[PDB]
């Protein structure tokens, strides 16, 4: 009559843990007799081979750990712990993440240069992407020597005013170059925009 024995950390149902790491699922339990065990990743049997580098087990404090993780072994993983008198089991979801500790990637081709009659006016656009959460801003080279800033992010100006410039009654003031600074800890750089104006 089998029984799971010391909820060590079965309360750790999830193990989100970055590529190549490892990760230890334990399922002690007990009951008379020794309960053959087996394991399941969302289905019927999972063996070895279906992973390169294999598996390696303990039919000694009966549990599982494996190691150098990758995204394709994602999913729910199930302890199952049985004798003739019943069976127990548990299930662990595994969530492999993949970071790119580079600095924000910018779309090829933005923002793109444009043109309209004065009193009219048109936009240039930036797309976020995407991990270390970027802090974002545009500038323009005027003044005699440096550029000068559009207006910040985190400035209490959200998902909406996101540079997406808006240029009301576009004068020739505005004439020149526009560029797109958004950084994290890694660094920062982007491509840039001139206005062809009438």
């Amino acid at each position: 009559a089998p029984y799971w024995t010391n909820t060590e950390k079965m309360e750790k149902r999830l193990h989100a843990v970055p590529a190549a790491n490892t990760v230890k699922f334990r399922c002690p339990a007990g009951g008379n007799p020794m309960p053959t065990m087996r394991w399941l990743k969302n289905g019927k049997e999972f063996k070895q081979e279906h992973r390169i580098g294999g598996y390696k087990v303990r039919n000694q404090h009966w549990s599982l750990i494996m190691e150098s993780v990758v995204p394709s072994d994602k999913g729910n993983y199930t302890c199952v712990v049985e004798n003739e008198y019943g069976s127990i089991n548990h299930t662990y979801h595994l969530d492999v993440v993949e970071r790119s500790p580079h600095r924000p990637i910018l779309q090829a081709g933005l923002p793109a240069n444009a043109s309209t009659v004065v009193g009219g006016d048109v936009e240039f656009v930036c797309k976020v992407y995407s991990d270390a959460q970027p802090h974002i801003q545009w500038i323009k080279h005027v003044e005699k020597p440096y550029l000068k800033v559009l207006k910040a992010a985190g400035v209490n100006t959200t998902d909406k005013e996101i540079e997406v410039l808006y240029i009301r009654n576009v004068t020739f003031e505005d004439a020149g170059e526009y560029t797109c600074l958004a950084g994290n800890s890694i660094g920062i750089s982007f491509h840039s925009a001139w206005l062809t104006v009438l």
């Binding site: 950390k9 309360e11 750790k12 149902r13 999830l14 193990h15 989100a16 843990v17 970055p18 590529a19 790491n21 979801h93 969530d95 993440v97 993949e98 970071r99 500790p101 976020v128 992407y129 995407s130 991990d131 270390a132 959460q133 970027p134 802090h135 974002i136 910040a152 992010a153 985190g154 400035v155 209490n156 959200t158 950084g183 994290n184 800890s185 920062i188």
Partner: protein
């Protein structure tokens, strides 16, 4: 990623970071609970302010240690998007650069404090995950 509200998993016990309406902060595991949905923004390059989407409270200790949620974007809320070469992230206080106060996870779903974190911990490494079983 930029896009979405995402959740903070800390590997120690696995807990997700969640801000209860009375202002206090811990984590527990059920990802149906309503307060682990966070979306982040940046006053600047280095740092981030974290807010529970549904109840609108940012995270702010004060010297305190006492991990609380503030109503105001103030000088308590601003911690560091740390990406360490082990790919987990982590977050350490504005209040200082002094002595590495960091965001934690005590193994029991009761983190606290910042005096006793540093010296490791595994209490501190967090992952941004998506809403779904994506």
């Amino acid at each position: 990623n930029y896009k979405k509200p995402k959740l903070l998993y800390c590997s120690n016990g696995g807990h997700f970071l969640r801000i209860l309406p009375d202002g206090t902060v811990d984590g527990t595991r059920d990802r149906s609970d309503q307060h682990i949905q966070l979306q982040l923004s940046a006053e600047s390059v280095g740092e981030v302010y974290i807010k529970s989407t549904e109840t609108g409270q940012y995270l702010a200790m004060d010297t305190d240690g006492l991990l609380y949620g503030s109503q105001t974007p103030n000088e308590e809320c601003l911690f560091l998007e740390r990406l360490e070469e082990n790919h987990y992230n982590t977050y350490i206080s504005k209040k200082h650069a002094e002595k590495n106060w960091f965001v934690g996870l005590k193994k029991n779903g009761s983190c606290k404090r910042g005096p006793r974190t540093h010296y490791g911990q595994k209490a501190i490494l967090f992952l941004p995950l998506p809403v779904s079983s994506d």
